[PDB]
Structure formats: structure tokens, C-alpha cells
Amino acid sequence: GSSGSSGAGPGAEEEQLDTAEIAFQVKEQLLKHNIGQRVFGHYVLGLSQGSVSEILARPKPWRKLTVKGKEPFIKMKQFLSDEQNVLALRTIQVRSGPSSG
Numbered sequence: 001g002s003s004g005s006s007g008a009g010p011g012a013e014e015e016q017l018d019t020a021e022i023a024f025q026v027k028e029q030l031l032k033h034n035i036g037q038r039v040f041g042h043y044v045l046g047l048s049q050g051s052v053s054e055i056l057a058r059p060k061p062w063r064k065l066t067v068k069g070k071e072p073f074i075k076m077k078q079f080l081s082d083e084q085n086v087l088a089l090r091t092i093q094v095r096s097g098p099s100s101g
Contacts, residue, residue: 014070014074016062016063017062017070017073017074017077018062019055019059019060019061019062019065019073020059022059022073022076022077022080023055023056023059023076025080026040026056026076026079026080027056029079029080029083029086030086030089032086033086033087033089033090033093034093035086035089035090035093036093036096037049037052037053037056038096039089039092039093039096040052040089041053041072043089043092044075044076044079044085044089045071045072045075045076046075047072051072052072055072055073059073
């Protein structure tokens, strides 16, 4: 691999997103700071634990998913557009319950 990229132009489209890559990269970033899928799916996604866990297990084709299928993946790929998103999630993994008073 290794090629390059040169083409500036930020934008606010919905586009096609590699769901298996988002799924992968999320698991990586959670592991990067040892975070759990529930807190990620509860905050970032707004789904149940069991819901995002399926999406992380079985990241069906972007073309297969509905808007209500793409909803999490949009939020996830946006999360992965900036590392501060995971850094802020580390706090929540403390504040998931009584990590002391």
C-alpha cells in the first residue's frame, strides 16, 4: 500500500463509509484507552449495549443500511475524525457508576 492524497475540500455530505473499518477503528480506539462498548454506544451512539455490539459484530454494507442503520456509523466515523472524542469518553468510563465517591 502507501500512495498519497492531495485534494482539500471539507463538506457536510452524507457519503459512503466503510462500516467494517468504522467497526474495527472504534474497537481499536476503545481498546487504546480500555473503554467499554456500552458507554460508547450509550453516549456516542445513543443505542443499547446489545444494539452497538451487533453493529460491531456484523457491520452490514453501507448500501444495505437504512438511515436508522447509518445513524450509529455516522456518529462513529465523526468520532474517529477527531481523537479528542475518545479522550473525552475515557472520563465517562470512570463516571459509568461509583468509581469511588
